[PDB]
Amino acid sequence: MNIRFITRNRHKIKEINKILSGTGVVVLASEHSIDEIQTENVHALIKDKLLKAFKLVGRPVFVEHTGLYIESLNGFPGGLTQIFWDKLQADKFSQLLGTSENPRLVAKTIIGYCDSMKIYIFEGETQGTISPVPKGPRDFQWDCIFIPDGESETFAEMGDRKNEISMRKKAFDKFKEYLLEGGK
Amino acid sequence: MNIRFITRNRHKIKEINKILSGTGVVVLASEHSIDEIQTENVHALIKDKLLKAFKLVGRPVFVEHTGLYIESLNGFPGGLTQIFWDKLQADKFSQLLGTSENPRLVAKTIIGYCDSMKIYIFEGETQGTISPVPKGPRDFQWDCIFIPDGESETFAEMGDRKNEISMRKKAFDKFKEYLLEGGK
Amino acid sequence: MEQLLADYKKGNVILFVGAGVSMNLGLPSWSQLVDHIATELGYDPDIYRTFGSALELAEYYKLKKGKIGPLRSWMDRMWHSSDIDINKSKVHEYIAKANFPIIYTTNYDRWIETALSNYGKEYIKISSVSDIAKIDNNKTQIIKFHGDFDDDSSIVLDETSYFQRLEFETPLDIKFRSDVLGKSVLFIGYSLSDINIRLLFYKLSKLWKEQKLEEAQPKSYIFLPRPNPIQEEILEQWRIGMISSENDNPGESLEEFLKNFVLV
Amino acid sequence: MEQLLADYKKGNVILFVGAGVSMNLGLPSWSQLVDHIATELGYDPDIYRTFGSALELAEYYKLKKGKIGPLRSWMDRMWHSSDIDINKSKVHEYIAKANFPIIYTTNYDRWIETALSNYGKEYIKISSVSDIAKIDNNKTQIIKFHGDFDDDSSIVLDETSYFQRLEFETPLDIKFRSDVLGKSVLFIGYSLSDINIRLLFYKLSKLWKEQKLEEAQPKSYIFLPRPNPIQEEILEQWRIGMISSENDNPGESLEEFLKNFVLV
Amino acid sequence: MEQLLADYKKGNVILFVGAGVSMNLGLPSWSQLVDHIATELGYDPDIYRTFGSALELAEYYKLKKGKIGPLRSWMDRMWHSSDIDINKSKVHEYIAKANFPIIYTTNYDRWIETALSNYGKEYIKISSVSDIAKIDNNKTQIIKFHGDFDDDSSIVLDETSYFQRLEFETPLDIKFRSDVLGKSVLFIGYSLSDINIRLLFYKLSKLWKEQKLEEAQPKSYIFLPRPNPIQEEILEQWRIGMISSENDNPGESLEEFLKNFVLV
Question: Do D46 and B119 touch (CB under 8 A)?
């Protein structure tokens, strides 16, 4: 059973092929473009992104979106987490909130999956803290700032165990649990 | 000749008639609900708001948007000013940006007018500063923290002297000079 | 506009009414008619709308269930609910107090019939040729153009039945042609936006002008809130006029439009 | 699939060509014509796109500028500009190398004819009723079923024209019925939301039924790049099986679909 | 003549066959059936043929025997007797070696099919409406337009089923009309005293004049070895031009007429 995926990042498909290895499902890539709406309700964002994806392929497909929920910002990220990120960048974000009084933020990845019968929502959660300095590489997203609770390094630094402790790993764990029982 | 307006604010029904007095045009008010998309580019917001308005009535109309642009945040809110205000409010806005090193910010009101044949964009600008404490009545938008240039009080403390130096007043006498020329 | 009232004094106009008078009463819309029969099938209420135009849901539901029967019973139960009052809608009563001898409806409910019965107007509802016979020359004649819920055969909710209504072979269309060979049609609540509809009109359009012979096929008009130039320029080539108001809320615009026919 | 290849081996297939094949060639879109036609009419393109449909506004331009002449002059100018290369499109090469005896099309351009000329295969263009006498059975017949740029009367660009076309009374419909009677017909490049092909399938059915020719008429086929069980179950009632591909990209799916006829 | 050969090089000639082609084989005549049914009812085969005219006589034989069963068995026995040689006739050889895609016939025998199989030509025999699905464009189509001995109901040997074939609404006539739409049609081996060929001409001429396509449809042709001026004059008004040979013996005249298509 094949499940399509609509992304432009070419490492994502091989990463979830490594994640879902031996689960009875292979993941096929789609090279189209989905113009997502920018609404703070991330559930509506994943719903209309999944609707546009099923309009694009018409097969069992899923979409994912990564968001943030800062307690000091009252969850102003989320639906515009990407917009917030490239409009601020790492050093300005670090001096804005890592030097602030409340660096407590919740990082969440919401996965919406449709099997051409219904739609299904999976979400992961990870409580983190904001660094006052970007550490490690600045290549992929806000991993150079995001320090989890219970650890010290920013998510760009450790390498491989961030793929085991992330919120999208937990959302993929519930998604993998859902497909491994037969999708009932 | 009549030009309608699509808003749910009571004071604008008499305010735009008072501002645009002498032009021979009475500004009518329509009470339909407006859904606005939330992107940073203000021009697309005024464009699609006018498109949905003209689809709603089909008569020569206009619509208004007023937004903030923090110079330290590279103009991050823009058209997300209302939702950023609803997520933060005045005291968190003051403590986060009015107490910062750079409270200098830009605020632009863009008027989009449709004459049922073409589209026209009018833009007014007035620079200002963010107050480190909220002053005045907080019942009317984010005006309790906006201190313009050359003054000392917030925009909610302006009273009836508000419509002499405001950015919306500049957008509206651009609207008045274009309307008094016969719409050429 | 003025000629419509002039021929309404002479009774040479035929009221034609769609769902635009039916949205005011809190009736179930076509969107929850898509939401249901998808959740009654195993689908999500959304996600079918990637492949559909809601006649395709009526096709898929009657194809899987074998008949149109469960859909007919469900829309008869929701369209004639207990909490919905006829009297809290001025457009129905404005239709009721007016002097219209022949009235054609494409809606499938009986709210026009209860509107005429609530204000003492004697009606004989007709849907099958049979009934055609029983026309109280006097009593208004309401004609269900797309059938009602008391006939499972000729009821038009589906793309197959909508395509059977292309060539107009059903004798209700023959009765319509015989009724409008010297009169006009006033269209209400018909959003020229959905091709089919548009088409419906087209074909229909023919009917009158069709026989421009002598006569004058008294002009015909539709009523929309929005005054766009494209639809009036398009509709004027089918011998149909355009009537619009300056009010933007459609229910109050339809109320003040029907107020012209209430007092005359 | 194998039934289509067996009928293609016997030459009982007729290729329909829609507008959806032209996306690989880089032709101007319909939306670009809406932008140009608003600029020519003195309108903003988006606000002209709002009120009116995607093709009525063409009849609005036709009525405002007298006739269809300047519009189709613009279509003939930018639809055959020298910036378009025809060797780079693999799907037109696969069409021209296939053994299609009769190729119907609703495209107004000449790129199928130029594609047949570019690969050394003789073509005959049929647009009006006088060209049916020019049919040679040793050449591939091309029928511009919706008209062509060298005949303003046969052009179908407006709602007034896009209509009595649906009653199927022009002699090109008689020609179409005559070739389709014994042979299957393949539809490519259609978006399936167009009302014209659904009326075409429904009229076909009926015909090939009332004419007791139900035993005779193979199964017609339509190509869609995505799977669609609802539309497949609907189109099965009009005796047309859909063909879906595993490729999500539509251009690669269409090229892989038309690969199957070239090698034989 | 030259235009007929030009249409033959384009493959737009559909060939009919009457009994006059098969008269050279030593096949039994119609009087050879008349004396058999006369001895079958104990009549003399002159007093039986006085108060009946062939087709009736077969009507009476069918009515007295209950069906056309024994008559079909007798025609199939003596029409395909083993002493008849197919190689000895140049007419059937020239029929088989010519490149005719579609051949209609009103014969009931199989000698055209036997001539096509004898000279290495693949053929598809069509007798009823179910055989239209077996059409191959790589093989010669043989349509038994008047039925064959394999089917009892499709046989026309009597006056009433002659009238059934003469209102022209059977599905084989639909296939005939759709085949003869673009192509000229050659008739050989017919006599003008037959009513059904003249009424077929009249039906074709009225049908083309009805739908506006008379600019297409190049004219049909018939071959009569005896020239007739006023028959050419009446058939000119139906767009059929007669072709007259010069040798008075009809067999080799028909042979040298059919010689013209073998070499091409």
Answer: yes
